[PDB]
């Protein structure tokens, strides 16, 4: 996408403080709790019946970590998200059949998680920068659908 | 909220659809799969090629449900109760897709009811499809 | 945007049969009827109280014609909608304050109007091509918002 | 549909908001204008710079309305009747923007209620804001 250098440095700085494994597990878990229809892709994962079951489910945590790790790696290529995520885009379409609306939901939950985590440090300008990034990633992941 | 005039408009239009309801249902699906390819992610188990029996069959089911909703327009939540359970707990289609199908249904009706599809009827039909969509997503959480 | 040559020729062929003035008036009128909150920009236009008043309102017809004419001219530059609509984008943001969601609503109403007009000639593949075009135009018009 | 548990969660969270409701309302607005610039098209008559009295004032009004909705969560349509008339017939804000403000309100709450903003409360709050949004857009057509 297009971030101003001050937006880019805002995103970069905050992300250096993120425990990717922890935030990943939290974001995926909250996605499954707040928007329960997203559970549709994960019934191989065990008990998802209550909020506590979802948040404590080890498969959810593991997958959350895998997703946010790939997300992390994309922050290093903000200039070319589409190229970075082309293969994953294809995979999510052809093999996993994930409606790309899910990427948008996850992006918004991730922003809530960052806000919860960082409190007042997650200022309105920083949120704005992260919104552009998550929209960009969702875009990039949806790009090769057909 | 459907006004009495909206209900009259929907019954009149759907009345003229009559026996073609199933054929129009299939056409709307095909329009949706071509115009909004992301919707195909919910049908990986179907042959989505043109004229496929699976799509025609599904189109007929969708159309019959809408027929049921028109007949019970004053009591839709009850009439569609089983269908809202099915979409909420089983199928779990993201709510945004209901809009997409609604639009394609509207286009299909427009293409087949030249005389019936007045501005006022168009408005009533869009309202009606939004209400059906609201009922079908009622129990998602 | 990106249309295959068969999509491009489908769009082009159908459009050669459109009376731009008539379809324009119809599409804008139906926008104002089906989504009445869009009337917010037009109270300078007179009586918009009933469907018949809206569809017969001469200012609505005139504006519809102006809008679809610009749309028409954009069909000639499908390869670069953003460049074609940059000035209008700016105008709609800075001076007219039109929420770009309105462009999407109009695009969908226009597709309904074409369907109503052309009946069975407006096949599923042709609709698909037009959906890409109207999304592209909405995009192009929203591009310079800030 | 808000379950009793959802209502308990919303009352608890909003309770902790208490007296800061107005300040949080303004922050949510500012977040919305920066993250989703298209929403500024509805406020051309405001000074939208940081700390502007107009935004703070408006934030307080938004917050008081939400406070009113929490107090009358069993009877929201009635409680917000004047506000739905106002948005439907006067302001005529496109319904998509309600989502955007709801998200920014959620972010604001998350940033200020570290202990309260559990997964279950998050879910209840999102549901609640969606219900408020539905009521405020009820009379648009
Ligand atoms: C930030 C956005 C996302 C990114 C970066 C991402 C990335 C990934 C990666 C790296 C994998 C592993 C691929 C492999 O094995 O080769 C994966 C798998 C998968 N993802 Fe995504 N993903 C994202 C969002 C989502 C969302 C929102 C959902 C659905 C709610 C989803 C559902 C899946 C599923 C079902 C798999 C398969 C897991 C398995 O085999 O057990 N992903 N994703
Ligand atoms: C106007 C709104 C809709 C109506 C009235 C409707 C109605 C129905 C009905 C009657 C069934 C058959 C249930 C049965 O077997 O007993 C069904 C199944 C299904 N629907 Fe919905 N539906 C609507 C919207 C959607 C949308 C928007 C999607 C996805 C884009 C969708 C995806 C499905 C799928 C995947 C099935 C299962 C098909 C199968 O496995 O055979 N539906 N729907
Ligand atoms: C296909 C999308 C659209 C295009 C191509 C378009 C194009 C135009 C053009 C060519 C003008 C005249 C500009 C000038 O005087 O220099 C205009 C004005 C205007 N448009 Fe748009 N427009 C579009 C959609 C919309 C929508 C959906 C709305 C709101 C519902 C809207 C509201 C306005 C308004 C209020 C004016 C000012 C009219 C006046 O001064 O009386 N337009 N537009
Ligand atoms: C949670 C949903 C919202 C609530 C509870 C809410 C509440 C209110 C209230 C209490 C007022 C003041 C009414 C008065 O003066 O008596 C108002 C005005 C207004 N609202 Fe809404 N609102 C909401 C969403 C929105 C959204 C999403 C937008 C646009 C992005 C919006 C735009 C406006 C505008 C333009 C005014 C007029 C401000 C002025 O001229 O001073 N509202 N709202």
Q: How far from C131 is each of A19, B30, B100, B107, C52, CA to CA, in Å?
A: 42, 14, 11, 12, 28
Dist. CA A126–CA A9, nearest whole Å: 10
Which pairs from C75-83 meet CB under 8 Å and 24+ separation?
A: C75/C11, C75/C12, C75/C15, C75/C133, C78/C1, C78/C3, C78/C8, C78/C11, C78/C133, C78/C136, C81/C1, C81/C136, C81/C137, C81/C139, C81/C140, C82/C139, C82/C140, C82/C143
Does A40 contact B at CB distance below 8 Å?
Answer: yes
Helix, coil or strand: residue B93: coil
B103 touches chain C (CB under 8 A): yes
Q: Best mutation site among B66, B91, B131 for ligand 2, i.e. most ligand atoms within 8 A of its Cβ?
A: B91
B130 three-state secondary structure: helix
The rounded radius of gyration (Å) of the Cα atoms in chain D is: 14
3-state SS of chain A is CCCCHHHHHHHHHHHCCCCHHHHHHHHHHHHHHHCHHHHHHCHHHCCCCCHHHHHHCHHHHHHHHHHHHHHHHHHCCHHHHHHHHHHHHHHHHHHCCCCCHHHHHHHHHHHHHHHHHHHHHCCHHHHHHHHHHHHHHHHHHHCCCC
Q: How were these coordinates obtained?
A: X-ray
Cβ-based burial of D73 (10 A; exposed 0-12, middle 13-18, buried ≥19): middle
Exposure string of C132-142, with b = 16+ CB inside 10 Å and e = fewer, is bbbbbbbbbbb
- With 0-12 CB in 10 A as exposed, 13-18 as middle and 19+ as buried, what is C44? exposed
Cβ–Cβ contacts within 10 Å for residue B113, how many?
20
Is the minimum distance from the CB of B132 to ligand 2 under 6 angstroms?
yes
D86 lines ligand 4 (CB under 6 A): yes
Is residue A106 within 6 Å of ligand 1 at its C-beta?
yes
> Following CA atoms A42, A43, A44, A47 in sequence, which dihedral angle do they give, to the nearest 10 degrees?
110
Look at ligand 1, atom 43, and give the residue with the nearest C-alpha: A67
Sole residue written with tokens 């129990």: B139
Per-residue CA distances from D20 to A104, B111, D56, D63 (Å): 30, 54, 12, 9
Whether C2 has its CB under 8 Å from any CB of chain B: the answer is: no
Alpha carbon distance C39, C48 (integer Å): 8
Residue D49 backbone class (left: φ over 0; alpha: ψ -120 to 50; beta: rest): beta
Domain count, chain A: 1
How far, in Å, CA of C69 to CA of C63, rounded? 10
- What is the span of the domain harbouring residue C113? 1-146
Length reported for chain B = 141
Residue B102 to residue B131: CA distance in whole angstroms: 10
What are chain B's domains? 1-141 (1.10.490.10)
DSSP label at residue B37: G
Which pair of tokens denotes residue B103?
């639009």
The answer to whether C102 touches C43, Cβ cutoff 8 Å, is: no
Is the CB of C54 less than 8 angstroms away from the CB of B119?
yes
Q: What sign does the CA torsion over D119, D127, B84, B39 have?
A: negative
Q: How many CB atoms lie within 10 A of CB D63?
A: 21
Enter the tokens of residue C99: 């929420």
CA distance B121 to C36: 14
Contact across the interface for A101 and B92, Cβ inside 8 Å: no
Q: What count of other Cβ atoms lies within 10 Å of the Cβ of residue D10?
A: 22
How far, in whole angstroms, is CA B47 from its chain's centroid? 20
CATH of the domain at A36: 1.10.490.10
Which of B38, B96, B140 is closest, CB to CB, to A145?
Answer: B38
The answer to whether the CB of A80 falls within 8 A of the CB of A36 is no
B92 Cβ closer than 6 Å to some ligand 2 atom: no
Residue A3: φ, ψ to 5°: -110, 140
Instruction: Give the list of residues 6+ apart from residue B29 with CB closer than 8 angstroms, or none.
Output: B55, B58, B59, B62, B101, B104
Q: Give yes or no for a contact between B12 and B116, defined as CB atoms under 8 angstroms apart.
A: yes
CA distance A78 to A134: 11
């Amino acid at each position: 996408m297009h971030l101003t250098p001050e937006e880019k440095s805002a995103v970069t700085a905050l992300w250096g403080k993120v425990n990717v494994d922890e935030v990943g597990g939290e974001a995926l878990g909250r996605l499954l709790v707040v928007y329960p229809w997203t559970q549709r892709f994960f019934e191989s994962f065990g008990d998802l019946s209550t909020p506590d079951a979802v948040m404590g489910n080890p498969k959810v945590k593991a997958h959350g970590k895998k997703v946010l790790g790939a997300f992390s790696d994309g922050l290093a290529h903000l200039d070319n998200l589409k190229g970075t995520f082309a293969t994953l885009s294809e995979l999510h379409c052809d093999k996993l059949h994930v409606d790309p609306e899910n990427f948008r939901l996850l992006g918004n939950v991730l922003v809530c998680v960052l806000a919860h985590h960082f409190g007042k440090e997650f200022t309105p300008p920083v949120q704005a920068a992260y919104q552009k990034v998550v929209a960009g990633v969702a875009n990039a992941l949806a790009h090769k659908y057909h | 909220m459907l006004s009495p005039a909206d209900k009259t408009n929907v019954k009149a239009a759907w009345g003229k659809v009559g026996a073609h309801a199933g054929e129009y249902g299939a056409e709307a699906l095909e329009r949706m799969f071509l115009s909004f390819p992301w919707t195909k992610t919910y049908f990986p188990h179907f042959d989505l090629s043109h004229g496929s029996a699976q799509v025609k069959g599904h189109g007929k089911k969708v159309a019959d449900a809408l027929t049921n909703a028109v007949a019970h327009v004053d009591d839709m939540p009850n009439a569609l109760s089983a269908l809202s359970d099915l979409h909420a707990h089983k199928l779990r289609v993201d709510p945004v897709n209901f809009k997409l199908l609604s639009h394609c249904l509207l286009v299909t009706l427009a293409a087949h009811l030249p005389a019936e599809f007045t501005p006022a009827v168009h408005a009533s039909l869009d309202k009606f499809l939004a209400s059906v969509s609201t009922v079908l997503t009622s129990k998602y959480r």
